Design a protein around this motif. Sequence first.
Motif, mmCIF file in Angstrom:
data_model
loop_
_atom_site.group_PDB
_atom_site.id
_atom_site.type_symbol
_atom_site.label_atom_id
_atom_site.label_comp_id
_atom_site.label_asym_id
_atom_site.label_seq_id
_atom_site.Cartn_x
_atom_site.Cartn_y
_atom_site.Cartn_z
ATOM 1 N N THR A 1 0.825 -1.214 0.000
ATOM 2 C CA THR A 1 0.000 0.000 0.000
ATOM 3 C C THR A 1 0.863 1.270 0.000
ATOM 4 N N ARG A 2 2.096 1.165 0.499
ATOM 5 C CA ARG A 2 3.054 2.276 0.460
ATOM 6 C C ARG A 2 3.399 2.663 -0.976
ATOM 7 N N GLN B 1 0.494 4.336 -2.966
ATOM 8 C CA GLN B 1 0.301 5.772 -2.729
ATOM 9 C C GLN B 1 1.308 6.620 -3.520
ATOM 10 N N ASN B 2 2.212 5.959 -4.247
ATOM 11 C CA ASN B 2 3.177 6.632 -5.120
ATOM 12 C C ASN B 2 2.680 6.804 -6.563
ATOM 13 N N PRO C 1 -0.694 8.339 -7.295
ATOM 14 C CA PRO C 1 -1.293 9.681 -7.359
ATOM 15 C C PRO C 1 -0.258 10.800 -7.234
#
Lengths: 122, 99, 49, 419
Positions: D66-67, D70-71, D73
Amino acid sequence: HSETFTRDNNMGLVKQCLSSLYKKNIQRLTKTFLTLSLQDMASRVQLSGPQEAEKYVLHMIEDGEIFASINQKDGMVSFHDNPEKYNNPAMLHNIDQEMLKCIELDERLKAMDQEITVNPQF
Amino acid sequence: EIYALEIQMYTAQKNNKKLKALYEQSLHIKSAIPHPLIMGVIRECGGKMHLREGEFEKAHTDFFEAFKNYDESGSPRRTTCLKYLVLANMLMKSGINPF
Amino acid sequence: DNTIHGRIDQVNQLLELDHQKRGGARYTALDKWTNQLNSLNQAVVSKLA
Amino acid sequence: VENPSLDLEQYAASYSGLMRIERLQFIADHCPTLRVEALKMALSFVQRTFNVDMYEEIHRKLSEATRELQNAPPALDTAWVEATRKKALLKLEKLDTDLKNYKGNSIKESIRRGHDDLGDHYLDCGDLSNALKCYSRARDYCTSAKHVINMCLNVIKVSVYLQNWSHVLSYVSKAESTPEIAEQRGERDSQTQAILTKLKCAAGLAELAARKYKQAAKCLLLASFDHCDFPELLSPSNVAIYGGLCALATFDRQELQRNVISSSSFKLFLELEPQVRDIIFKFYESKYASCLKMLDEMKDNLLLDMYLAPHVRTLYTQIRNRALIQYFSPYVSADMHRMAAAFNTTVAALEDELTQLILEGLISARVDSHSKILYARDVDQRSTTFEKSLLMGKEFQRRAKAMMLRAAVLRNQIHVKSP
């Protein structure tokens, strides 16, 4: 290692290997292709340009390392790939001669066996 | 005679995955039994899953025994059962000796 | 599957058939004798030194 | 490394035990986009079967997954990590005393019952090295052949997750020839206990990793459809994919039709996989244009598979090679342009493709690159035996020179001393 080679005064002979590799490269082609272009060969052997290709073709032939020929009109190398059929005196004579050298070798061994005859016991 | 009606329903349905399992299981039950026409109803449908399967040597002999059961009693399939006995012998690639 | 003994020239739309039969025995048999001598003479050389 | 056409729902359905966690994690690894999904499905089943070793592993990946999302957007449920952990830690000690009070009884079957419970709950918690040993000692507390097998089966189960396939095979070789060669006939005409169907599932899969794709095919082709879903090793939908592509590559045309295409034993497994069936067929039917067309587009999915990734070249390439031989051999002279599109490639490409195979392989044929044709090249028997006889004799003559001088140097005690 130009130094290491030239230190031993056998540089040149090491460069004769540089040429024999080019000649090995072309020697292999006989086993794969039987009709090949000068340009194709030039690109595959790495010598570049159809002349450099046509060059070693001639030399290898002239010397007699490879069985091949050239059709300049199209600009192609045809690989004869065929020497001798053992169907004549040509071999017969060599067969006679190569054999006589094995008999020459037996003659020596027979004499060398009789040399051991006279020496001490067992 | 229960397995006869099971092989008869799936012959109308075209379920070869169950029919193959049913025929193989109706040859162990084919031993402990008296003797009706039904003993040829399963053999003809059983030979069909050895033509389909390819091994024509296990269909050939299946259609000879089923033909014989229609020979004794009723013959609705006897007229079309011989079509599979002959079709076997040709496709058996050796037989060529039916009649 | 190797029933028809033959091979196809696709360019010429034909079928050359296997048949060219000759004394293949002599050469293959002698081949063996040639090989045994090769391995034999080296075994006699490796005896002496 | 990615494929969009992938159903994770089926991938998890037919598997269980550690195999679910191992396969789901390999998919999430090499397949992104469906890493969103694949890490959620490993998480849920790890929370069952009292497993912390895998939760601390799997959930840590969910964070970094999930990290990285988020890269463009989930949280560590430490309330649960404690809960399962002390529950499990004390359940060990219960089973400890259960075995230790089974050892005090001196019963042969009751102690083996204890042992099998211990190994199970150490497997549960992700501990392999411990789980390993529990079954090993269960060998001593036995009597019958079935007890020495029913443990030897478990012995292997763990040595697969460990990836010591050498000992997977050491105990299959034992377990196979245990009850006088599988009870002689196989329990009198069709056995309810489908046992060797499992023993050959592993004997093959152990060889699959060990590169023996032909030996692997022999064990995977014998896999009957009695065992079907055995989730703790390999599904039957894969046994078809695995053993089929294995044989295909290393089997000749002859053994194919016999031991693959027209054999009922394996036929049922082929039915399951329609694509795998078509490539085996189109090879034998020699419709190669399609054969490879199919296989290429399957490569995307077969790579994402856990156990079929590490043989995706040696198989795929060895099949191409096989077909390239089989297409030509029948012909004495073949047009390269026809052969080109037939092997999904270009004329120039085909030229080099064959070239290598001429040198190395059994493609006894030369290349006419002028008109782009391939001619069969056969041997002049006569020339051969003559040619070599001269040369061999000349070698013999050369050594005779040498060992004549060598007879001389030793006869004269010739050598350069040191001191």
